[PDB]
Design a protein around this ligand. Structure first.
Ligand SMILES: Nc1nc2c(ncn2[C@@H]2O[C@H](COP(=O)(O)OP(=O)(O)OP(=O)(O)O)[C@@H](O)[C@H]2O)c(=O)[nH]1
Ligand SMILES: Nc1ncnc2c1ncn2[C@@H]1O[C@H](COP(=O)(O)OP(=O)(O)CP(=O)(O)O)[C@@H](O)[C@H]1O
Ligand SMILES: Nc1nc2c(ncn2[C@@H]2O[C@H](COP(=O)(O)OP(=O)(O)O)[C@@H](O)[C@H]2O)c(=O)[nH]1
Ligand SMILES: [Ca+2]
Ligand SMILES: [Ca+2]
Ligand SMILES: [Ca+2]
Ligand SMILES: [Cl-]
Ligand SMILES: [Mg+2]
Ligand SMILES: [Mg+2]
Ligand SMILES: [Mg+2]
Lengths: 421, 439, 32, 342
C-alpha cells in the first residue's frame, strides 16, 4: 500500500488544499521548486505516498486542482508553493457554480468532470500500488459540494476497490456566504454517507469559536480558520507520511475506525491551539477537550466508538502510554464497552513550529449534533420550499431533497442507536 | 538426519525469524556471509545443525527458511540487512498490498493470488531434503497476513505434505503493542481453521514478554526489537534439541508424543528463567534450584495464567549451561513439597529433562546478560485456557453488535464463519474444563 | 523417585524423572 | 478516583462496603461489565479470575481467593484435612468425618462405626451437604441416596445456663492481599432457645442452632437474648461467673490456632503474592465448644453475612485493611501470626 491521489475542489477545497501542501512540503523538506533541502532520512522514506519523483530529483505533489471558475486557482498558482503543482493537473471551467449543488453535480460540473477523470487516470496509471484518494472541499458551496460528490461517485465507479477519504468543511451561519448552505450540505452528506470510507468533519462553527474564544481573535478571517485546518490535516496524515506501525495506510485506518459502514464521520482535534513548552499530561488533557475539537459537538453528549491519538515530537513513550491509559480509565463511561481497546496511539519523532503536538481523531456518536443542526436549518427553509427555484431551474425535483433529508435523519438515528447500546 | 523447514508469515513472523536466525548463526559459529569455519565437511553433511542449514559447494550455510509477507517493507529490511547474504532471493517472498488487519483479506482475497507461488518456493526447499520432518510456522494471530494467509498455508501444507509434522509459534495479541481493534476476530478465525492442521503450537502473549522486558530488563517502553530478542531465546531453547546432538525432542514427532496426548489440546505453556539485564553491573549467578523454582512463577511464563488452578498433562525441562542431573532431581524434590503441581489421573506425574552443556548465547549489545545456566519449561497445563477465555470474551462483546463484520463479509467471507469459529472455541474451552476441573 | 532413560553425549544429557505413576479438506474443497 | 464494579447484588456485607466506598467521594462505581475497574466485588459462582490483571495501568483487586472453595465446601474440607500432612488424619479439633456419594468412604465409615458398637461408645453421627442425626448407620445412608458427609455428632456440647441450651460460635476472618490473617475481635454465639435433649434427635430445633431454624420452629425465640445472638462481652462474663475462666483462655487460643492452621495450609495454593491480580476474602468460621471447653471446627463459609449490629464496624474494617491498603485515600482486628523455632 503506497500512493495517495489528492483532489481539491472549489474555493474552500483549493484554499485549504494549498495550505495542506505548503505545510507538508515544509515538513518533508521540499522547497517551492520541488527540491529536497532537509536534514533527515525520515523525511524521504514515505515521500512517494504524496509526491511523484521527476527529472533532476524534483518532488511533484500527486495533486489535482479542480474548480468551475479560474479565480481561486489563479491565486493558488501565484501563492508561495504555487509553482510546485504539475501544470496539467489544473482543471478549471469559466462558468462558476453560483453556490448551487445542482450546478456542481448535474449541469456545469457534468461538463467538466470527464477532463478531471482524465488527470486522475494519468496519476493513477503511474502508481506502483494506489491506496486511494483524498478530496478537500466544502459542503456549503456548489463546486466542492456538488462537483466534489459527483467526482467521488465517478472515481468509485472506475476504482471500486480503492479507499475514498474526504476533508469536508461543514457550513455555519456564523461563517456563512449564502442562505442555501444547508441545502448544499444535506445533498452532499447523502453522497458522503454512501461513497466515502472516512470523512474528517471540519466544522466552520468550531473553527470560528476556537479563533474567537480560545485564540482571542476578535475578527476571524478564512486565513485564521485555515491555520487550524492545515495543522489538523498535517496531524491526521502523519501516520500515512512517516514510518510507523499504526494506521500507516488508508485501509488500516478505516478498519480500526469504522465499525459500521455509514458511521465514518470523524471529529478531529489538535493540541496545543496556536495562531513555550507543553507536558505530555497537558497535551493529552487538551487533545480530548471539547474546546480543541474541529467539530462543534460535545463529546460528553455521546460515546467514542473508536479513537486514534497521534503524538509528535521528542517525548517519553512511557509517559504517553500512562497518560493515554489515565484518560480512558478516568472517563471509561464515554468509551463503548463493546469495542475493547478502542483507543490506539501513534508517536512520530518529527514535530510540526512546535516542540510537541497531539492530533485526535474520534468516531463519536456526538457527531449526530452536527447533522441535527444542518437538518434543522434545512427543514426551516424546505417546509416553505424557500430558495428551491435555484435548484428546480437546473432540473432537480423536490423529491431528491426529501430523500437527502430522510437519509441524513436516518444517519442521526443510527448514531443514537449505538449511543444507547 | 531429518530436515525442518521454517516458514515466517507477516511482520511478526518475519521479524521474529530475523532474530531467531541471527541467534542460530551465533550458536553454531556461522558468519553473516554463511561461512562456518568449524564445519570440516565442505558442500554437504548430515550433522545436527544441517536440520536447519543446507550447504553450497562454496561452504555457504543457508537457512531452510521461507519468509512471506503481503507487503514488501519488512522483508526488504532482511534483503538489505546484516544477514542479506545468508538467504537466496527466492526464499524472500513479498506482495504489494497487505491484508489491512483483516483475516478475510489475507485468507480469501490476497491468499488466493500468492498461495501457489509460496507452495512453489517451499517445494524447492523440500526437493533438497533427503528426509523432511516438517515445518515450523511463525506468525501473529492479530494481523491479516499472520492470521488469514497462515491458515490457508497450513490447510495447503496438510494436502501437499500429509505425513509431515507442523509446529506453530503464534504471537497472541496484547493491547500495549497491538495495531488493530479486530485482533480478537482474526485470532479466533485463524485458531478455528488451523486447529486440525497443527500438531503443537507455542503461544507467546505479547503482554507477558512486554512485562518481562519492563520488570527484568528495566526497559521503560519495550520495542519489537526488545520483545523479539527475548522470544528468540525461548524459540532457540525449544529448537535446540533439533539442532544439537541429544536424545530428547530430537524430531518434530517427539514434540507431539512428549507434550500432546489429546490432539486438540496442543498448546504447551513455555516458562523461561533467568532473564537478567546486561546493564546490571553486579549480578549474583542463579543455581539450578533457583532457575527451576522460577519455572513455576507466573511472572516468567510466555502466557500469564495460573497453573495451580489447572492440571498438567506433560512437563519438559530444557536446561542450557552448567547443569547435572543430580542438581535437577534435588531441585524437583524440593519444588514438589512446596508447589501445587497436580497432574491429570491418566498421566504419570513426571518431568522429561534435557541438558545441553553450551550456555545460552546472547546477541552482542543486546539487553540480556550472559548467565552460566538457564532453563525453558514446556508444560501442557489446562491453565492456558484462561488465554482462550479472554479472547472469546472480547470476540463476544464486538460480535453481539456485528462491529467491523462488514469488512470481513466485503472480502467474500460468510457471517456464518464467525459463529462456526466461535462454536469451535466454545468446544475447546469445554475440552480444557473436562480435562482440568474436578466434580 | 525413579530416574530413567539416562542418555549421555559430549554436548549434554537427557533423562526422565517419575514422582508417581498414574491412577482434512482436499485440494478440491479448498479451491471451491 | 479509584473505580469498582459490583457483580453480587445479594451480598449484605459488600452492599455496605459499596455504600462506604461511595461516601469517601474517592471511589466511582462502574457498570458491572466495564473492565476498567480497580476493584471487583465478585459473583459467588464462576467468578472469571482468568480475566483479572490484564488491564494495563490498573492495579486490580478482587474480594475472593481463587481455590478458597477447598476450605468452604463440606466435602472438600474433609478431604483437605485427611490428605494435608500439616493437618493430618490425627487432627484433634475436627470431628471424625467421611465423604459419602449416593472417591467414596462408605466401607471405612462402617468399619469405625462398628468400633463404637463393639466398645459401647456413644455412636451418634450427622449427615449434611453444601440434615439428619441418628445412632443407626443404615438410616443415614438411606437418607443420602434419597454428595454428603457423615460427621461424628458432638454428644457432650457446652450448655449455657439458664436454659440448658446448645450454641455455635461464628468468627469473622479477613485475609488481605499480603496473606495477613485478621480475626475480627467481635464474634457471635448463635444460641438454641430450647433445652438440649440427648434422647430425641427426631426434634431438630434444640440440636440445630442456625438463625433461620430457631426463628421459625422454636417457641422461645428471643427469651434469653436479642435475636438468638450472645456477643463476646456477655459470654466472657458468663465464663468468669459460672466456670472461673475467660473467653481468651478457654476458647479463643484454640480458635486462633485453628484459623491459622486452615489458612496456612492452603496458602501456597491460593496466595496472590506474585500474581498479575490480587485477592482478599472474608471467611466465616463456625465452631462448637464441648463441656471440657475443647473447640471443634464445624465449617468454613466463603460468603458469610454478619450480625446486624456488627455490619458498620466490620465493613469499615474491610475498607481500612483490605482495600485502602492497596488504594490509599488522600484496630478492630487481631493479626494471627506465630514464628516459633524448632
Ligand atoms: N512480538 C512481536 N509482535 C509483533 C511484531 N510485529 C507485529 N507484532 C504483533 O502482531 C500483531 C499484528 O500483526 P502483524 O504481523 O503486524 O500483521 P501482518 O501479519 O503483517 O498482517 P497485515 O499487516 O494485516 O497484512 C499485533 O498483535 C502486533 O503487536 C514483532 O516484531 N514482534
Ligand atoms: N458435628 C456436629 N455436632 C454437633 N452439632 C453439629 C455438628 N455439625 C453441625 N452441628 C449443628 O449444626 C449447625 C451447623 O450446621 P452446618 O454448619 O452444617 O449448616 P450450614 O452450612 O447451613 C450453617 P451456615 O449458615 O453457618 O453456613 C451448628 O450450629 C450445630 O448446631
Ligand atoms: N474554512 C474555510 N471555509 C471556507 C473557505 N472558503 C469558503 N468557505 C466556506 O465554504 C462554503 C462555501 O463554498 P465554497 O468552497 O466557497 O464554494 P465552491 O467554490 O462553489 O465550492 C461556505 O460554507 C464558506 O463558509 C475557506 O477558505 N476556509
Ligand atoms: Ca457550457
Ligand atoms: Ca558440512
Ligand atoms: Ca495433519
Ligand atoms: Cl508427504
Ligand atoms: Mg465561495
Ligand atoms: Mg503487515
Ligand atoms: Mg455453610
Amino acid at each position: 500500500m503506497r500512493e495517495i491521489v489528492h483532489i481539491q475542489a472549489g474555493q474552500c477545497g483549493n484554499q485549504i488544499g494549498a495550505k495542506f501542501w505548503e505545510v507538508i512540503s515544509d515538513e518533508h523538506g521540499i522547497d517551492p521548486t520541488g527540491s529536497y533541502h532537509g536534514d533527515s532520512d525520515l523525511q524521504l522514506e514515505r515521500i512517494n505516498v504524496y509526491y511523484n519523483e521527476a527529472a533532476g530529483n524534483k518532488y511533484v505533489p500527486r495533486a489535482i486542482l479542480v474548480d468551475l471558475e479560474p479565480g481561486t486557482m489563479d491565486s493558488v498558482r501565484s501563492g508561495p508553493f504555487g509553482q510546485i503543482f504539475r501544470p496539467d493537473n489544473f482543471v478549471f471551467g469559466q462558468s462558476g457554480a453560483g453556490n448551487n449543488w445542482a450546478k456542481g453535480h448535474y449541469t456545469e460540473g457534468a461538463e467538466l468532470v470527464d477532463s478531471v477523470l482524465d488527470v486522475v487516470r494519468k496519476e493513477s496509471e503511474s502508481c506502483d500500488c494506489l491506496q486511494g484518494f483524498q478530496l478537500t472541499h466544502s459542503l456549503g458551496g456548489g463546486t466542492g459540494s456538488g462537483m466534489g460528490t459527483l467526482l467521488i461517485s465517478k472515481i468509485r465507479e472506475e476504482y471500486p476497490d480503492r479507499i475514498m477519504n474526504t476533508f469536508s468543511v461543514v457550513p455555519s451561519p456564523k461563517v456563512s456566504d449564502t442562505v442555501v448552505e444547508p441545502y448544499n450540505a444535506t445533498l452532499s452528506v447523502h453522497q458522503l454517507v454512501e461513497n466515502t470510507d472516512e470523512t474528517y468533519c471540519i466544522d466552520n462553527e468550531a473553527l470560528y469559536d476556537i479563533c474567537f474564544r480560545t485564540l482571542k481573535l476578535t475578527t476571524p478571517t478564512y486565513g485564521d480558520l485555515n491555520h487550524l485546518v492545515s495543522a489538523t490535516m498535517s496531524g491526521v496524515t502523519t501516520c500515512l507520511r512517516f514510518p510507523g506501525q499504526l494506521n500507516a495506510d488508508l485501509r488500516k485506518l478505516a478498519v480500526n475506525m469504522v465499525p459500521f459502514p455509514r458511521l465514518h464521520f470523524f471529529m478531529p482535534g489538535f493540541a496545543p491551539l496556536t495562531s513555550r513548552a507543553l507536558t505530555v499530561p497537558e497535551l493529552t488533557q487538551q487533545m480530548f477537550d471539547a474546546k480543541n475539537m474541529m467539530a462543534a459537538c460535545d463529546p460528553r453528549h455521546g460515546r467514542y466508538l473508536t479513537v486514534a491519538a497521534v503524538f509528535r515530537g521528542r517525548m517519553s513513550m512511557k509517559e504517553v502510554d500512562e497518560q493515554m491509559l489515565n484518560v480512558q480509565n478516568k472517563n471509561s463511561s464515554y468509551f463503548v464497552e463493546w469495542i475493547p481497546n478502542n483507543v490506539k496511539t501513534a508517536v512520530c519523532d518529527i514535530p510540526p513550529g512546535l516542540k510537541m503536538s497531539a492530533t485526535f481523531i474520534g468516531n463519536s456518536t456526538a457527531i449526530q449534533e452536527l447533522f441535527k443542526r444542518i437538518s434543522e436549518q434545512f427543514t426551516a427553509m424546505f417546509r416553505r420550499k424557500a430558495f428551491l427555484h435555484w435548484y428546480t431551474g437546473e432540473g432537480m425535483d423536490e423529491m431528491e431533497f426529501t430523500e437527502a433529508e430522510s437519509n441524513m435523519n436516518d444517519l442521526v438515528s443510527e448514531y443514537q442507536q449505538y449511543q444507547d447500546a | 538426519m531429518r530436515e525442518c523447514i521454517s516458514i515466517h508469515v507477516g511482520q511478526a513472523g518475519v521479524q521474529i525469524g530475523n532474530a531467531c536466525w541471527e541467534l542460530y548463526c551465533l550458536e553454531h559459529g556461522i558468519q553473516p556471509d554463511g561461512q562456518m569455519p568449524s564445519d570440516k565437511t565442505i558442500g554437504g553433511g548430515d550433522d545436527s545443525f544441517n536440520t536447519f542449514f543446507s550447504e553450497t559447494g562454496a561452504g555457504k550455510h543457508v537457512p531452510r527458511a521461507v519468509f512471506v509477507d503481503l507487503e514488501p517493507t519488512v522483508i526488504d529490511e532482511v534483503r538489505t540487512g546484516t544477514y542479506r547474504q545468508l538467504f537466496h532471493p527466492e526464499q524472500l517472498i513479498t506482495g504489494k498490498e497487505d491484508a489491512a488487519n483483516n483475516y478475510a483479506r489475507g485468507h480469501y482475497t490476497i491468499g488466493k493470488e500468492i498461495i501457489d507461488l509460496v507452495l512453489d518456493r517451499i517445494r524447492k526447499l523440500a526437493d533438497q531434503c533427503t528426509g523432511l520432518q516438517g515445518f515450523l510456522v511463525f506468525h501473529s494471530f492479530g494481523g491479516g497476513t499472520g492470521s488469514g494467509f497462515t491458515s490457508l498455508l497450513m490447510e495447503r501444507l496438510s494436502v501437499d505434505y500429509g505425513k509431515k509434522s507442523k509446529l506453530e509459534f503464534s504471537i497472541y495479541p496484547a493491547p500495549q503493542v497491538s495495531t488493530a481493534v479486530v485482533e480478537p476476530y482474526n485470532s479466533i478465525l485463524t485458531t478455528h481453521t488451523t486447529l486440525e492442521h497443527s500438531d503443537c503450537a507455542f503461544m507467546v502473549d505479547n503482554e507477558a514478554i512486554y512485562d518481562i522486558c519492563r520488570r527484568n530488563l528495566d526497559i521503560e517502553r519495550p520495542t519489537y526489537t526488545n520483545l523479539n530478542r527475548l522470544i528468540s531465546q525461548i524459540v532457540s531453547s525449544i529448537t535446540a534439541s533439533l539442532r544439537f546432538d541429544g536424545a530428547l525432542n530430537v524430531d518434530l514427532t517427539e514434540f507431539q508424543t512428549n507434550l500432546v496426548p489429546y490432539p486438540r489440546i496442543h498448546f504447551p505453556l513455555a516458562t523461561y528463567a533467568p532473564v537478567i539485564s546486561a546493564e546490571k553491573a553486579y549480578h549474583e549467578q542463579l543455581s539450578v534450584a533457583e532457575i527451576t523454582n522460577a519455572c513455576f512463577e507466573p511472572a516468567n511464563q510466555m502466557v500469564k495464567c495460573d497453573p495451580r488452578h489447572g492440571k498438567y498433562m506433560a512437563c519438559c525441562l530444557l536446561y542450557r549451561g552448567d547443569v547435572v542431573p543430580k542438581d535437577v532431581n534435588a531441585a524437583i524434590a524440593t519444588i514438589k513439597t512446596k508447589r501445587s503441581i497436580q497432574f491429570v489421573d491418566w498421566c504419570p506425574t513426571g518431568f522429561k529433562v534435557g541438558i545441553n552443556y553450551q550456555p545460552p548465547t546472547v546477541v552482542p549489545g543486546g539487553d540480556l546478560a550472559k548467565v552460566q545456566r538457564a532453563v525453558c519449561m514446556l508444560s501442557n497445563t489446562t491453565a492456558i485456557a484462561e488465554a482462550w477465555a479472554r479472547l472469546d470474551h472480547k470476540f463476544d462483546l464486538m460480535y453481539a453488535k456485528r462491529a467491523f463484520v462488514h469488512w470481513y463479509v466485503g472480502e467474500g467471507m460468510e457471517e456464518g464463519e464467525f459463529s462456526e469459529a466461535r462454536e469451535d472455541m466454545a468446544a475447546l474451552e469445554k475440552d480444557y474444563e473436562e480435562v482440568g476441573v474436578d466434580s | 523417585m525413579e530416574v530413567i532413560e539416562l542418555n549421555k553425549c559430549t554436548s549434554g544429557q537427557s533423562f526422565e524423572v517419575i514422582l508417581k505413576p498414574p491412577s482434512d479438506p482436499s485440494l478440491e474443497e479448498i479451491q471451491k | 478516583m479509584y473505580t469498582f464494579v459490583v457483580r453480587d447484588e445479594n451480598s449484605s456485607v459488600y452492599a455496605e462496603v459499596s455504600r462506604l466506598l461511595l461516601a469517601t467521594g474517592q471511589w466511582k462505581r462502574l457498570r458491572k461489565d466495564n473492565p476498567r475497574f480497580n476493584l471487583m466485588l465478585g459473583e459467588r459462582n464462576r467468578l472469571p479470575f482468568g480475566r483479572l490483571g490484564h488491564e494495563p495501568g490498573l492495579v486490580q483487586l478482587v474480594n475472593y481467593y481463587r481455590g478458597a472453595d477447598k476450605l468452604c465446601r463440606k466435602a472438600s474440607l474433609v478431604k483437605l484435612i485427611k490428605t494435608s500432612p500439616e493437618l493430618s488424619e490425627s487432627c484433634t479439633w475436627f470431628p471424625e468425618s467421611y465423604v459419602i456419594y449416593p472417591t467414596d468412604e462408605r466401607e471405612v465409615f462402617l468399619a469405625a462405626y462398628n468400633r463404637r458398637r463393639e466398645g459401647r461408645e456413644g455412636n451418634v453421627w450427622i449427615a449434611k451437604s453444601s440434615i439428619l442425626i441418628s445412632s443407626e448407620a443404615s438410616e443415614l445412608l438411606d437418607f443420602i441416596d434419597e454428595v454428603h458427609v457423615i460427621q461424628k455428632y458432638l454428644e457432650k456440647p457446652l450448655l449455657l445456663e439458664p436454659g440448658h441450651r446448645k450454641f455455635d460460635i461464628r468468627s469473622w476472618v479477613l485475609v488481605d492481599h499480603l496473606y495477613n490473617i485478621y480475626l475480627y475481635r467481635e464474634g457471635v454465639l448463635r444460641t438454641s432457645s430450647e433445652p438440649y435433649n440427648s434422647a430425641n434427635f427426631q426434634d431438630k430445633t434444640c440440636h440445630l442452632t442456625n438463625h433461620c431454624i430457631q426463628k421459625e420452629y422454636s417457641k422461645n425465640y428471643g427469651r434469653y437474648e436479642e435475636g438468638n445472638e450472645m456477643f463476646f462481652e456477655e459470654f466472657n462474663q458468663y465464663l468468669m461467673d459460672a466456670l472461673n475462666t475467660t473467653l481468651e483462655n478457654s476458647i479463643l487460643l484454640q480458635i486462633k490456632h485453628i484459623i491459622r492452621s486452615c489458612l496456612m495450609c492452603i496458602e501456597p495454593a491460593i496466595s496472590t503474592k506474585h500474581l498479575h491480580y490480587q485477592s482478599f476474602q472474608l471467611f466465616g468460621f463456625d465452631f462448637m465448644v464441648d463441656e471440657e471447653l475443647k473447640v471443634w471446627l464445624i465449617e468454613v463459609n466463603g460468603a458469610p453475612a454478619c450480625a446486624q449490629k456488627l455490619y458498620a464496624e466490620l465493613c469499615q474494617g474491610i475498607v481500612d485493611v483490605a482495600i485502602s491498603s492497596v488504594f490509599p485515600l488522600a484496630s478492630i482486628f487481631i493479626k494471627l501470626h506465630h514464628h516459633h523455632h524448632h
